Design a binder for this molecule. Structure first.
Ligand code: GTR
Ligand code: CL
Ligand code: CL
Length: 298
């Protein structure tokens, strides 16, 4: 059985290679019984639409950002929150441990089994003009993921959110529909956004990680041994992914700088102050508020 998985990222991207590595492991351990074919580059649809396919059992696996998954699974809002993690090492420790496992377990009741977190760096603003301070964002049309938290966030920052699928963003930057967007270094590179919006400002305002999930309907068809094998292959793929990822952050930043991008250092304090209301607005469950307390102290 060759199961199917979706990713908006290109064929050679670390998230795609990670799931392919998981497939290789499963193919070996199950002696051909289970493998996974990845369909990259939004071939199967947007993140919004592919998450619905998984809920319906129309799609077996999905690799999506938590910043869209949190439309369905409330716990996924927690790791999206701006300025929550101190740095990459803090995030990795949290997501690899009990807190990460607790968040992944939240998805099952919604028809999706959470299997692993993949790194996504920190998301930063980029635009067709240089954003040198928060005030420079005022009135700008900034694309966000199709998830309400980001609309609220842009409002607090004085910008105008335009939610749209990942595959439409380059076109919007070239057409004038949007003035900018926000993402990590490998995405700024690999979606070609740097060609159209040549000013990248290190706001580092979210570390929203990626999530790999399986349809609950499909998972439930697996033997108990197969379920253990799938979870273990998913966890093993995190370390594989991270090695590819850390190199790509370097090579992508180098590539776009060579192409003429201005990399802008920006005072984050006004951003942090502006977005604080999001925490109580979007995280209302006492269990999740306690989780945030534990994360802040980890
Ligand atoms: O902004 C987006 O649409 C994209 O951002 C990337 O960082 C993430 O890897 C994609 O899964 C998608 O969420
Ligand atoms: Cl300012
Ligand atoms: Cl999308």
């Amino acid at each position: 059985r060759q199961y199917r998985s979706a990713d908006v990222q290109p064929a050679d991207y670390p998230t795609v290679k990670a799931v392919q590595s998981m497939s290789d492991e499963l193919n070996k351990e199950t002696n051909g019984k289970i493998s996974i074919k990845v369909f990259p580059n939004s071939q199967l649809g947007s993140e919004k639409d592919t998450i619905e396919q998984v809920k319906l059992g129309a799609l077996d696996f999905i690799r999506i950002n938590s910043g869209t998954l949190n439309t369905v699974c409330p716990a996924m809002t927690v790791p999206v929150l701006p300025f929550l993690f101190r740095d990459k090492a803090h995030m990795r420790a949290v997501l690899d441990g009990p807190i990460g496992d607790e968040i992944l377990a939240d998805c099952a009741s919604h028809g999706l089994v959470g299997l692993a977190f993949y790194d996504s760096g920190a998301r930063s603003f980029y635009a067709t003009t240089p954003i040198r301070k928060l005030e420079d964002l005022k009135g700008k049309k900034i694309r966000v993921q199709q998830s309400d938290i980001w609309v609220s966030m842009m409002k607090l920052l004085g910008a105008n959110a335009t939610p749209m699928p990942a595959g439409e963003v380059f076109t919007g930057l070239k057409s004038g529909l949007i003035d900018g967007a926000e993402n990590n270094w490998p995405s700024y590179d690999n979606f070609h956004h740097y060609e159209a919006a040549k000013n990248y400002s290190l706001s580092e305002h979210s570390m929203a990680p990626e999530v790999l999930l399986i349809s609950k309907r499909v998972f439930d068809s697996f033997t108990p041994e197969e379920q253990v094998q799938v979870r273990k292959a998913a966890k093993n793929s995190v370390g594989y992914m991270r090695q590819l990822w850390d190199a790509m952050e370097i090579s992508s930043r180098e590539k776009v700088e060579k192409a003429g991008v201005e990399v802008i250092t920006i005072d984050k304090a006004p951003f942090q102050a502006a977005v604080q209301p999001l925490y109580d607005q979007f995280v209302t469950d006492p269990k999740l508020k306690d989780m945030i307390t534990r994360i802040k102290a980890a």
